[PDB]
Amino acid sequence: STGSATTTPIDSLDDAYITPVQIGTPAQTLNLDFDTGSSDLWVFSSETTASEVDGQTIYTPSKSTTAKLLSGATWSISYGDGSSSSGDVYTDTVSVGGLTVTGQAVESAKKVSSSFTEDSTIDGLLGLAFSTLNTVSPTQQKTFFDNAKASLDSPVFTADLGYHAPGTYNFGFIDTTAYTGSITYTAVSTKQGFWEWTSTGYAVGSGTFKSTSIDGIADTGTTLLYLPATVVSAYWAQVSGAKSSSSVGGYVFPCSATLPSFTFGVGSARIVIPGDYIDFGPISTGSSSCFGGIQSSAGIGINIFGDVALKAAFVVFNGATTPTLGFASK
Ligand SMILES: [Xe]
């Protein structure tokens, strides 16, 4: 089997991407944030605290004839951004772009943090990291991909995020018309539960490539590119007027600047992030100070190849017995 679904940016900045997901019988379509940085499928629901729901589409398991409460199961999660959610668990039928999993753990939110409430465009998350990170207690549950893997033509999924435009998530096959050149595969460590790999280095604009190993995770649920302070300072030094701002929370730059590209290495191959992809717009409405899309990971404890980097590539998440990651230009 295979699945193929279009993923769409939630706003003019590509702050995140939503993908339609069919849950239950009859289908309830929710727009979920596919997150290779986490391992819970959770949704706004009829059980969510009414004041914490503001425009989202909710899952109502009582209207699904295939929903079954997972007895005594609970979940609770906290993200790198400081957001959180928690609730109870149903199993139900979940389909993504024509690919169907029966008995999938669907985590129903009783509580969500304010950042989720305030974003009317995301109805929940669909986690695509390893199941070892799933938060369900006292019986850990498998992610959609893990449940589907054995059924897929090939045990892979691909992320093809668009810049200011829709993209595609494919399950079970590699679309060879969707990238240029060849796909370079690189090794993955699953020890922390993520798609963790080691980049071979970087370049700033037209500058020389610096060969240096940079460990990080491929994370579609993170917007920006978070890298060591040395790398990030080298980038922003090429933008006149750019500065790290503690009040803002990161590097800002004049909105009138033209940003240089940023290249990262995958083995001997190179993925180029165009400068425009690194512009995240005014720090506040009407401001001429703009927020940068490459930021320091120094506070975080891990480097993160978020959407800013991933959207410059065709990315293969290979879930073979020994997982690997593939990157191609496109
Ligand atoms: Xe990098």
Side-chain angles (χ1 to χ4, degrees), residues 199 201-202 214 227 264 305:
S199 171
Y202 70 100
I214 304 162
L227 290 178
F264 62 91
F305 293 91

Side-chain angles (χ1 to χ4, degrees), residues 149-190 192-212:
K149 236 192 305 89
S151 298
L152 300 173
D153 288 3
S154 173
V156 308
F157 69 94
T158 66
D160 181 8
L161 302 180
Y163 163 65
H164 293 173
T168 306
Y169 279 101
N170 298 147
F171 296 81
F173 71 108
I174 287 158
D175 181 355
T176 59
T177 71
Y179 55 90
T180 56
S182 50
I183 303 176
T184 293
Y185 294 87
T186 194
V188 166
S189 178
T190 60
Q192 280 188 95
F194 306 117
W195 292 92
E196 186 173 357
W197 64 290
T198 301
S199 171
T200 45
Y202 70 100
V204 173
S206 63
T208 65
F209 188 84
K210 172 72 162 161
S211 298
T212 180

Side-chain angles (χ1 to χ4, degrees), residues 40 70-77 87-89 105 107 133-141:
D40 288 45
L70 185 63
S71 186
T74 59
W75 66 276
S76 171
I77 190 181
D88 53 18
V89 190
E107 300 171 39
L133 300 180
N134 174 266
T135 68
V136 175
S137 189
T139 308
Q140 259 214 331
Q141 298 296 304

Side-chain angles (χ1 to χ4, degrees), residues 238-242 244-257:
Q238 295 306 309
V239 180
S240 190
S244 185
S245 189
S246 40
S247 58
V248 173
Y251 275 91
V252 292
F253 70 94
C255 289
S256 61

Side-chain angles (χ1 to χ4, degrees), residues 24-25 59-62 64-67 69 90-93:
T25 311
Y59 174 57
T60 309
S62 83
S64 171
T65 63
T66 42
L69 188 66
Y90 294 79
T91 50
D92 211 342
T93 301

